[PDB]
């Protein structure tokens, strides 16, 4: 039931969106090799992702989290990345989006840098690159991230 | 997949050595989280 609804690049909603894309990139211990050499993107498209069975889903599961800590959700918008973007639009979050050998253990990874996603969209690492170049460093082939609403309520503080 | 850990919703990957790297997220539950934007993009060449 997902409708992809296209934003206008003068629209507030895009722009805001694009922002957060844009300054929260970061350099990489890896110096490029996951998710390539970048300081910025070139934004092709934006769309609004829209579900009822989904959304209903995320709200019911809000609820519960924000009344088991003191009616808090401590919701966030963070970036995902996955060569899996077009299940997740379709049939939402599920195990088989879980990264099993996480340092947290097996679970859905989302990052505050927006080149942190980056570093997953073709895969763990960046897998084996561009299905077309082979390159994890390509400047050609159109990548999709996601930002998403995610519900961390009382979040368990691991340190580096 | 794995559980959160008792009394808790997710955890938080708080980055302690590397000073301008933010958090890292992780939810054991899908239902935690909805995919609201899908951004197409490029990664730029710099000068
Ligand atoms: C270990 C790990 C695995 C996947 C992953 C992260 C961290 S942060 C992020 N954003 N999109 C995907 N991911
Ligand atoms: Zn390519």
Same mark, same amino acid.
């Given at each position: #039931?997902?409708?992809?609804? *296209? !934003?206008?690049? *003068? *629209?507030?909603?895009?722009?805001?969106?694009?922002?957060?894309?844009?300054?929260?990139?970061?350099?990489? $211990? *890896?110096?490029?090799?996951? #998710?390539?050499?970048? =300081?910025?993107?070139?934004? !092709?498209?934006?769309?609004?992702?829209? =579900?009822?069975? !989904?959304?209903? $889903?995320?709200?019911?599961?809000?609820?519960?989290?924000?009344?088991?800590?003191? =009616?808090?959700?401590?919701? $966030?918008?963070?970036? +995902?990345?996955?060569?899996?973007?077009?299940?997740?639009?379709?049939?939402?979050?599920?195990?088989?989006?879980?990264?099993?050998?996480?340092?947290? #253990?097996?679970?859905?990874?989302?990052?505050?840098?927006?080149? @942190?996603?980056?570093?997953?969209?073709?895969?763990?690492? %960046?897998?084996? %690159?561009?299905?077309? +170049?082979?390159? $994890?460093?390509?400047?050609?082939? +159109?990548?999709?991230? /996601?930002?998403?609403?995610?519900? /961390?309520? @009382?979040?368990?503080?691991?340190?580096? | 997949?794995?559980?959160?850990?008792?009394?808790?919703?997710?955890?938080?990957?708080?980055?302690?050595?590397?000073?301008?790297?933010?958090?890292?997220?992780?939810?054991?539950?899908?239902?935690?989280?909805?995919? &609201?934007?899908?951004?197409?993009?490029?990664?730029?060449?710099? &000068?």
């Amino acid at each position: #039931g997902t409708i992809l609804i *296209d !934003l206008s690049p *003068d *629209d507030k909603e895009f722009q805001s969106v694009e922002e957060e894309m844009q300054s929260t990139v970061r350099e990489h $211990r *890896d110096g490029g090799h996951a #998710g390539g050499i970048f =300081n910025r993107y070139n934004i !092709l498209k934006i769309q609004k992702v829209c =579900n009822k069975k !989904l959304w209903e $889903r995320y709200t019911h599961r809000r609820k519960e989290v924000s009344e088991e800590n003191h =009616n808090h959700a401590n919701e $966030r918008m963070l970036f +995902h990345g996955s060569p899996f973007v077009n299940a997740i639009i379709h049939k939402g979050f599920d195990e088989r989006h879980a990264y099993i050998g996480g340092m947290f #253990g097996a679970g859905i990874y989302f990052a505050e840098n927006s080149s @942190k996603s980056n570093q997953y969209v073709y895969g763990i690492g %960046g897998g084996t %690159g561009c299905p077309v +170049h082979k390159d $994890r460093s390509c400047y050609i082939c +159109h990548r999709q991230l /996601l930002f998403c609403r995610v519900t /961390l309520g @009382k979040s368990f503080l691991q340190f580096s | 997949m794995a559980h959160s850990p008792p009394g808790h919703h997710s955890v938080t990957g708080r980055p302690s050595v590397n000073g301008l790297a933010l958090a890292e997220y992780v939810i054991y539950r899908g239902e935690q989280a909805y995919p &609201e934007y899908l951004i197409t993009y490029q990664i730029m060449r710099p &000068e």
